[PDB]
Amino acid sequence: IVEGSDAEIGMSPWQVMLFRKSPQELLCGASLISDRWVLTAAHCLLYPPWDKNFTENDLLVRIGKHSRTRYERNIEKISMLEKIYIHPRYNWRENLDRDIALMKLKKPVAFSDYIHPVCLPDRETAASLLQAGYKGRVTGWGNLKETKGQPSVLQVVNLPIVERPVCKDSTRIRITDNMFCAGYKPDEGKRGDACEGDSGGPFVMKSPFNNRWYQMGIVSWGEGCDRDGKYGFYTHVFRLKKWIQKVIDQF
């Protein structure tokens, strides 16, 4: 996260860290949507252009974290994957369309003050909150700039959803209905964006109707980080919910 701020303790208790076994490193962000399912970007697991094809045993899920690098004894929980499910029409070859995957945990995680699932939007939630100007919240342990380095603790930043024509006109990539973009414009003066390591984390919004946090987006892609006239693109979670439900129902 660029131009964010340190997260408060238990501020994002659905935050999940995708961690590589060997060498030990942060692979991406993710989110806890139930006691045994984690949601992240397909490109965190599968990205043939950079030779990424992670399997279950390459990774761990760390839940309840705040510090990036510490082992947060008594606070975090560390879980193994039983199974990875990538959207079958994830388009890595062109624009990361449908950039979404699910990970089933081998065992149920226990909820606590630091571990707790975020809600998934239904059609009305999406309809009412996914509007230009409405702000969402992005969190992650990614880079503080494109080029200080890495944060000591989980970073947070609130960014406004941007009009779809403005998203379009900011890039050469073909934008689909399974994506939305967010970030301030140059004239708004305020800054903020996801950056390298933030991928797969959640873009959430707090419904003013039932006062619950909903994960509307998944950090997908951007051109650089926090560049003027550029925006972060996020997977539209509600549009791919049928797939999410199908996977969880069947598996």
Binding site: Q24, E25, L60, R68, T69, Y71, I78, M80, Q150
Partner: peptide, 10 residues
């Protein structure tokens, strides 16, 4: 920069 995790999770 990562602290070792209980090397049982591994």
């Amino acid at each position: 920069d990562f602290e070792e995790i209980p090397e049982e999770y591994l």
